[PDB]
Amino acid sequence: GNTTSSVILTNYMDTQYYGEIGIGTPPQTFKVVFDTGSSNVWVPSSKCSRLYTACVYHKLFDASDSSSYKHNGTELTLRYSTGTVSGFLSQDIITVGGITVTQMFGEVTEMPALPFMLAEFDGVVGMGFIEQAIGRVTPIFDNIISQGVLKEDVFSFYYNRDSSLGGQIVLGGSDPQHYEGNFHYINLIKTGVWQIQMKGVSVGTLLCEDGCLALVDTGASYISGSTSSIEKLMEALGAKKRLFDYVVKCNEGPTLPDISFHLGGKEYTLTSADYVFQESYSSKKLCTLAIHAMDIPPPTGPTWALGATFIRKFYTEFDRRNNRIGFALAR
Numbered sequence: 443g444n445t446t447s448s449v450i451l452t453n454y455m456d457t458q459y460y461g462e463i464g465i466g467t468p469p470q471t472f473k474v475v476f477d478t479g480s481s482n483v484w485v486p487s488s489k490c491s492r493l494y495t496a497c498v499y500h501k502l503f504d505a506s507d508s509s510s511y512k513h514n515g516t517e518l519t520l521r522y523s524t525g526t527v528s529g530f531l532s533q534d535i536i537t538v539g540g541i542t543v544t545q546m547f548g549e550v551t552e553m554p555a556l557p558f559m560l561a562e563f564d565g566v567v568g569m570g571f572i573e574q575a576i577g578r579v580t581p582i583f584d585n586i587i588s589q590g591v592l593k594e595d596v597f598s599f600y601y602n603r604d605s606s607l608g609g610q611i612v613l614g615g616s617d618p619q620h621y622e623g624n625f626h627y628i629n630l631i632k633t634g635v636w637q638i639q640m641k642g643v644s645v646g647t648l649l650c651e652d653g654c655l656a657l658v659d660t661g662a663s664y665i666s667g668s669t670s671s672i673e674k675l676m677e678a679l680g681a682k683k684r685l686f687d688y689v690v691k692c693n694e695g696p697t698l699p700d701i702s703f704h705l706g707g708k709e710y711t712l713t714s715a716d717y718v719f720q721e722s723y724s725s726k727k728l729c730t731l732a733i734h735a736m737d738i739p740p741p742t743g744p745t746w747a748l749g750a751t752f753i754r755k756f757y758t759e760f761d762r763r764n765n766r767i768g769f770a771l772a773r
């Protein structure tokens with residue numbers, strides 16, 4: 443087909459990027475993260491007990507208000523790094539960027555207050571492959587592709603730094619307004635995962651010396667590595683570990699070295715301004731780093747993950763026809 447389509451994103455505090463989709467007839471609207479690190483669509487459900495406080499604070503999908511709903515009921519549990527959601531399968535028409543698609547998705551009935559009370563978004567639209575879909579449920583982008591409307595079998599992510607357009611996902615191509623220079627492509631190394639070979643992580647190559655893996659994860663806020671790798675990285679930066687993050691004396695933030703990720707021959711460099719939440723310059727304040735430990739079990743990991751920290755600097759094209767990821771300088 444001839445169409446490309448776009449989804450406008452909201453940037454909450456540089457940590458959460460999400461857009462709007464519609465589900466059902468008439469459309470019920472949900473804030474959703476578009477997540478290349480997972481493959482299932484889910485939203486919180488009206489059948490979620492309100493003893494889950496996360497279900498009191500998010501928009502709930504009521505299948506009883508949709509005339510296009512089709513029951514399935516297969517129970518599924520989706521295990522993420524920071525928490526788990528559980529529910530049952532449903533089918534309805536989903537509207538994303540003005541493209542309409544019949545889509546199987548999860549109605550979440552069990553949604554833990556931590557971490558999900560911290561989510562601005564209601565749910566997740568997985569942009570991954572059918573291979574990592576729980577229940578082998580056909581992902582939304584595979585269903586969009588089956589319509590033959592998209593110009594290209596690709597989608598692209600722009601995450602703005604400004605917290606104005608928060609971001610943009612192009613379905614069926616890319617947007618030249620939000621990148622510059624050439625794309626550099628790295629082909630995927632594992633079946634059904636948006637994952638690439640990484641050849642080194644430099645700090646001012648201290649880590650990933652004999653190669654490692656990098657997941658390009660649009661649904662993650664930060665750059666992550668294994669607890670071991672990050673502990674080494676953070677010793678090199680002089681950062682202190684806390685419960686859920688690494689921090690430095692805010693005055694030390696602008697003195698911190700460049701972090702470089704060796705991907706497909708090129709070096710992808712983040713400066714301190716790219717990975718330090720510089721909320722103060724005080725020696726008596728602590729400043730959080732957009733880099734945390736996240737141990738990912740096999741078969742996906744151990745692996746680094748490149749989240750919004752990375753994507754903010756590098757406009758990312760996800761190419762399904764040629765199984766590759768393209769990076770260009772974001773503008």
Ligand SMILES: COCCCNc1nc(C(C)(C)C)ncc1C(=O)N(CC(C)C)[C@@H]1CNC[C@H](C(=O)N2CCOCC2)C1
Pocket residue numbers: 457458459460475477478479480521522523524557558560561562566657659660661662663738742747750
């Ligand atoms: C750019 O917008 C950022 C949105 C904020 N994202 C998160 N917010 C929270 C808060 C709720 C705290 C806000 N918690 C966690 C995340 C999070 O990073 N993810 C999950 C949620 C989208 C539900 C990863 C998504 N991609 C698969 C990641 C995985 O689980 N794995 C990597 C691939 O292999 C399997 C494991 C998890």
